[PDB]
Design a protein around this nucleic acid. Sequence first.
RNA 1: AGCUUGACUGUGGUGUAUCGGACCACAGUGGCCUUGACGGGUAACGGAGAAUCAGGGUUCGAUUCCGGAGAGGGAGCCUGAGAGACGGCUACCACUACCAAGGUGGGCAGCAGGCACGCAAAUUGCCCCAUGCAAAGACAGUCUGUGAGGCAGCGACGAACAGUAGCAACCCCGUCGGCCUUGCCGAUGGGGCUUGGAAUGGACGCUAUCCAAAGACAGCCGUGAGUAUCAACCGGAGGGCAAGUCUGGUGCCAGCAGCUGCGGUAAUUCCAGCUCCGAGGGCGUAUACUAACAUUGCUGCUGUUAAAACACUUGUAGUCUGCCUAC
RNA 2: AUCCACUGCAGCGAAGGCGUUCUGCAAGUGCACGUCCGUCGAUCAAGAAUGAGAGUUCGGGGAGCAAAGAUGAUCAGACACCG
RNA 3: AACGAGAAAUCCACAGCCUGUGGGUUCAGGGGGGAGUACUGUCGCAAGGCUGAAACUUAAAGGAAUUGACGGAAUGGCACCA
RNA 4: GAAAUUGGACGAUGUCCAGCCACUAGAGGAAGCAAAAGUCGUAACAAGGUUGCUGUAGGUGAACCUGCAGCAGGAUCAUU
RNA 5: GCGCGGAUAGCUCAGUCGGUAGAGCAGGGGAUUGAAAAUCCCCGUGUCCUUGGUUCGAUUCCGAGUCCGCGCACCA
RNA 6: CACCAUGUUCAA
Lengths: 64, 177, 141
Amino acid sequence: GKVHGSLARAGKVKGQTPKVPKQEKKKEAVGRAKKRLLYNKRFISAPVGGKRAQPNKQPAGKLG
Amino acid sequence: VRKYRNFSKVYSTPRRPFDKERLDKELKLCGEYGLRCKKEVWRVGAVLTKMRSAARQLLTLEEGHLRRQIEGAALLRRCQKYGLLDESKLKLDYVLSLTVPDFLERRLQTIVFKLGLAKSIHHARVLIAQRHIRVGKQICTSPSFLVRMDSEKHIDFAPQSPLGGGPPGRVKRKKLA
Amino acid sequence: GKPHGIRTARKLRSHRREQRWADKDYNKRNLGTTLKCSPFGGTSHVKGIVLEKVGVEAKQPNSAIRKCVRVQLIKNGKKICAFVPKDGCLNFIEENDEVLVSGFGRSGHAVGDLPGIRFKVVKVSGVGLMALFREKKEKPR
RNA sequence: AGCUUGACUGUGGUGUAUCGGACCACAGUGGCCUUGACGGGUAACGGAGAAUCAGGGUUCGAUUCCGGAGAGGGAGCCUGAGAGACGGCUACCACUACCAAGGUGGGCAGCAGGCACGCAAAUUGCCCCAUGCAAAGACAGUCUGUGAGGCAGCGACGAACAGUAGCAACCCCGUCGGCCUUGCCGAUGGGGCUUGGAAUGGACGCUAUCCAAAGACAGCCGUGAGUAUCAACCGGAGGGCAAGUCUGGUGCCAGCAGCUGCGGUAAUUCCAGCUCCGAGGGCGUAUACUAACAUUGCUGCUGUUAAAACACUUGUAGUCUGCCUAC
RNA sequence: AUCCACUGCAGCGAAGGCGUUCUGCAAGUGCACGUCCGUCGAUCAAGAAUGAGAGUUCGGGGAGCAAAGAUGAUCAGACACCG
RNA sequence: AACGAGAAAUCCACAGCCUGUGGGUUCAGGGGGGAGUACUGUCGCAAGGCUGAAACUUAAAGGAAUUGACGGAAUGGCACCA
RNA sequence: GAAAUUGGACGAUGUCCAGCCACUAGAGGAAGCAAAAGUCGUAACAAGGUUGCUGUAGGUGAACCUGCAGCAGGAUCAUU
RNA sequence: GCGCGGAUAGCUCAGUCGGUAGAGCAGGGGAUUGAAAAUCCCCGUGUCCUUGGUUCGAUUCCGAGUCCGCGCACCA
RNA sequence: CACCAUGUUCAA
């Protein structure tokens, strides 16, 4: 911190971020079809001991 | 201004919107009975809540009180003609054992799926929404139609639909022509 | 203790009525000085003119500079200091640009780091600030 | 904390449709008040009702039905059964329109519409078809009127019901059950990819139907969907609180964050990408109020030290007050 | 001016408060009782009477102590503790 | 010194008989500040008493108790890094 | 039977006066609050280095100091 | 109304009278820090009003001369 | 019982 916050720094990070575009967009399920997807992914695809693995389990990264 | 027609809400949003128990149970029954959102569950739950609260306030009375006679006879006749309660369990304590599945299987979707008209419950909902199915003679097209015990034996395909005795739909009409 | 006894209704009611004035919520709701003194004269949103930009140093243990604008309200002339929410967004605001301001989510009090700043900006020049942030719309001229 | 001087009562009149200090003439000195008079305030039109509500209660009710008041502010009237009328008149005030300058006018808090004011609210539409009302008047010959009212347009206020896909074959996956030492085979079953036979709604069409006339709905044995491009979103992912110790950038900066907190070069919280969670044709935000709240406590709070027993007696209003009276 | 020791898990007073001896004046509680009255009571906004010390007012008094002030130390300062 | 009560300290002829909540009555409190402030009223010679807000600000203030640390606190041991 | 005449009432409206309320400008004075790293002290928390605090009075750069009386919420539940 | 003072890096300012240049503030880079804050190093930066003769260069010599402050003063 | 004042911000 040679210089701290000021009015000249508004938008610094949002202007710095390298702007990775978004991917190809295969369309999302809505309504009954999404309820079906969730019911299947949760309650029948079930390893019955750990109970109900959490959905957003991410691979092993720098922190482990 | 002077439009005196009524409207109302059929369901109530639960407190504690992020409880694991209620979320997983609601999703379980939604996937089991082919439901598009949680409000389809909460309206059945509100109907059940009204029925059970009426049953409770009636059971708080004796037998022979005018309220008991009229409203309890009405509740039992309702829960009978809609296949919630059978001839055996036709009492105000058995109407308190009502569960949301007790209405979700009365739901027209589940009935045309159990009658083998459709392969899966989602296929059933698709049929009803695409108006292939009559209840009695009327083409019903709302999958939440609460099929009474009487009109349960008159469910059938519609004569206007290709499934049954109707003309070919778009794709078969084109494939032939 | 309170008077029991079947003819103490007036005492009980008068005591409750004179004692309700110690509930600060009821007190501010019924005391007609907030409609007078508060800049939002009993109102969710107001429109104002951006007078100046302000960098407000965040309270300990935090050390940012919150971007606010001093706004002059069209309906009563009063000057307030609204906060400009989201990254940048203050580059979507120059002087004289008319802006709509709301309260924060606390009904007259400041949230988090902001000292004494208890309003925020919702739309500048008739277009939502979050719309401009996520490039849904563009600022006029 | 005192209020009232036609103020309160009486007698005789007046006036009125009628009782009455309603007004008058003469007499008297009354009338209300800590059970809050008089005054002040309006996040005051009132009620039916609305939202919650175990119970007790809390908050709101401009708004459709009933009552009141008003028609720019006042006031005075005529006509009439009925008006102190305003789509009646008269005058003054405040604004204002036309003018040939002598004169004439105005009244949307009716319906559309415009300017202002604002956070904030629609078409200068069609019609009397229905509901009613009025009149010298059933209908037709021979068009009663009706911005009441109806129907349309705009309308994510707010409600209800549906769709945004379904079934099966190919290829990679899991549980069960066999053969068998584990491994292999079959069976429902689930994800992603290709391929099939179908299905259907939107959208357009109809003078069929609907309609006062149209438009839309319903109907169609009229066409016709594959990236079914006819392509869902709004918020989130440390905790409360469902969901990532993922990857890149940032480096107490930018910013997030209702609260706690995150950010100081390895950010589960910022900016994004991917993934996931929640409600879903909706979701977020702000404001107000309700519940949570037994944090206004009648039910039902607390007062030694958390907020709170008057320094202490007395004492009026107020509140509360021992036992007893027929087989 | 003040009443040491006695002087205390002592007493009294509504509280504040009250301590040498003799004495004037009115009073209170408690106790004792086959005394009298016969509900006349409890708590109390308003109201009223007492209310340490400081403070003020008018007239005296002034020993001791002592705000202010003076003043010597201490201290970096010290119109603070201490004298 | 029991039961009970209490967040506990503690209370104990009460701070018990309280969610198994109601004998009667008065006063006061509603997070912390701003503030016992301003204005006004009233009493006083005055000092001031009584009465008494709001704008605004803030996520803790606070109470009892615990474990450690500290003490120019006490007691008792000790060390030629005293 | 019109204009005109006289005159009682109702009473708009103008002007003045009084009271009250609401909003508002103001030189200057004085407070409150908020904002990482400005100055002077060390008043409090331990016996906080003069135990602390209450009421009042006086003094003082500022915290504060001192007097009188009280309190322990004290650093004493305790000595013919 | 007559008469007196100085403009020096982006700002506050001491300048060898008649040899031509400097500090803090101001930004960056480094050292320090876990990151800062204070600190220490390194790097920026100036026709000194407009001008005339110009001693050798006029910043320092004089006079006109923006901008901004101030004292002197008439009597009976 | 001479005198013995002080310790920048967040973080732990």
